[PDB]
Design a protein around this nucleic acid. Sequence first.
RNA 1: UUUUCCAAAGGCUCUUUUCAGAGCC
Length: 798
Amino acid sequence: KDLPIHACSYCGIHDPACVVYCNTSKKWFCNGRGNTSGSHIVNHLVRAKCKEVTLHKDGPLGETVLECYNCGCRNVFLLGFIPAKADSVVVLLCRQPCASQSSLKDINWDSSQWQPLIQDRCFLSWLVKIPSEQEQLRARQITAQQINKLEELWKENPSATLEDLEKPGVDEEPQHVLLRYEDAYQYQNIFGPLVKLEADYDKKLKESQTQDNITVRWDLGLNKKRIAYFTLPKTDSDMRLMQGDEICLRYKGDLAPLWKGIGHVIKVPDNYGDEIAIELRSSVGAPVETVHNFQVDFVWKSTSFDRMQSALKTFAVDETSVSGYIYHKLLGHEVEDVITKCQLPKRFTAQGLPDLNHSQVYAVKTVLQRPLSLIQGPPGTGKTVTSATIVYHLARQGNGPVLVCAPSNIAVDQLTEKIHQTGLKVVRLCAKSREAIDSPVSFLALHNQIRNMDSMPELQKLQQLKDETGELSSADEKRYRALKRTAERELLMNADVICCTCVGAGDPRLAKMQFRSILIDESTQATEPECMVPVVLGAKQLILVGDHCQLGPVVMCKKAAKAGLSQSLFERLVVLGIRPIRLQVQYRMHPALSAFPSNIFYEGSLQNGVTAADRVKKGFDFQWPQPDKPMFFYVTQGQEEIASSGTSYLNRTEAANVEKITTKLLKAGAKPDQIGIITPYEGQRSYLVQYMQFSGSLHTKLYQEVEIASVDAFQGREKDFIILSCVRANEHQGIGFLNDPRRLNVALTRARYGVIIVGNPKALSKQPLWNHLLNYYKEQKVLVEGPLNNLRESLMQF
RNA sequence: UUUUCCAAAGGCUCUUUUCAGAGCC
Ligand SMILES: [Zn+2]
Ligand SMILES: [Zn+2]
Ligand SMILES: [Zn+2]
């Protein structure tokens, strides 16, 4: 009848050792698996981002708080139990750093036997008894989708029952993304709510980030560089500290008068470096002398989303914002093909750049003859050289300035270096936040060029005065602003090629300009409005470069992802009916590694531009299961564990295996910078960092030199030897986003010399693509398990 | 078997002096 005080929100099962109370949500939940693959309590914890667990009053342990004996951390995802060697008393300790920093140092305690408290997405039976299957089915049954809906209702209001899910029927679902449109106003009305939802979600998830009572080195700078170094106390474990964001520094202490300054991040965590560094744009009134009792806060900004909305409305209301043909093509309207009447250069090669192959030459000649061209660039095909050829030819056409944009600043830097290699005059536009960022192409930045602009000397005098003092008078500031605007306008008109980011093209300084040529790059990594921001500038000839098989843009809002916002402009153009021209040759992999992904994801179209003897590293005496094939799959029988964040995964057994193979690789003579570690899960990456940094069997700096990153963090990077840990291994659950073929594509194509795959074939074989992976690897007879020294071919079949 | 937990990004505002003016980073 009436639910007791300790009753599950989802089902209401009442039992002493079956209900767990959450301090964050002030609700009880059952440990029963239910219809879904996960327990109710674990599902509530992961969905509601809670990290506090309170045991029921009656049970094997009674009213207990699961706190680490060393540090007392509340986050249950880090605690683990150790059975005593003398009695049955269990020791609850954090995985790290409490394993080595434990004050108890009990003889019966050992950290090797340590296991996570959460297993198979549910609490262990001895702690919380799993409800009996018959009782857990005879009671009220709730499915996953309505569970998520009820959790959302609880989040938006802490009063919601089962009847609140059906009787109201809120709906208000965002309009789904269409493939074919009819009006620009329709496009704006459809994509406005999605952008607004994304911005709101980002603001909500990023505004709740602050720290208090931190130290600061507080070093100074000659040219007004208030540079502050401080380290996050790692209690919040927030990685949102990023280049270009805004940080407000508040000094509420009594040592100095209260100060509230604004600055930008200049240095994020690095290899063994940490000590995040920020640059303050405020005056000299900052409390330099004080170090402690410093408060910091991150405030979200809406510049990017405002730029997307402005571009959308400009496209909706301005007929000349884009060419008519491009406007009709983007809306899916069926129109006849148009051939651009451009003069074809006799030689397709670029001065100062390597000669293109036949496929690249054909791609260039086809692109130059079409107002709209789509290029599918497989990994390792030298797409940068191709794009350099395109910009070279476009500038040689003399049809005004040529705009280049890319979602990532690294891609922009690579492309601008490539074009500058031809000797062409290029101007790189950087944001104010990125002005202090040091880059190899920073000498080509707009602000640095202005600082080196010697035709007008009073501008330099004002600049150095600003560098040596604070803000000048109002008239002086107005004159300086006018001089800067005039100089940058002259530079931009004089410049032949302007390169920046896709969002950065929305800068007012770049505004009020018309460009007849745009070569949006890496578009497969950007949301459709992000790619659409630069084109409303007056595009007439428009080129996309990217690979849908590589990866897609990352969207955080669940509703936006469901509505189709994750789709890139490249994908929509491809599915519209435009066949993208794809480069057929590449020089990045030894043929053995490149044979499989070409066969699978590129229907056997890629060609190996390098030979086997070319892609062998000298002084590398490492044994292989097949001497001709420098890759293999190592089989591990580990169990996945929930990461500290509560939504990622890790595995200790695979981490130890990775450590062993990396130690062997360094013993083989491979340079430490060549060894890369790739994991799709952030929690696994952090655990590997902790395991390889603090506990180093070999030289600690030796392990330090290698670097670990997420899939798309490493995607823009190319190295010799790569070792992958797929992490996920669950009998009753899925692999997660590992079923996405794009991540498999980038993971297999990230190498140059060798790939070492580590994972559990039994769990991965359920997904058909990974089953094909396993079948191919067994056909090559490189599935190996057991001792590293004594390699044995696995007998498992899939 | 849910949908997955994964990067990158990045200064303007106010006022009817609005054909404009004012102030901030
Ligand atoms: Zn329940
Ligand atoms: Zn909760
Ligand atoms: Zn602890």
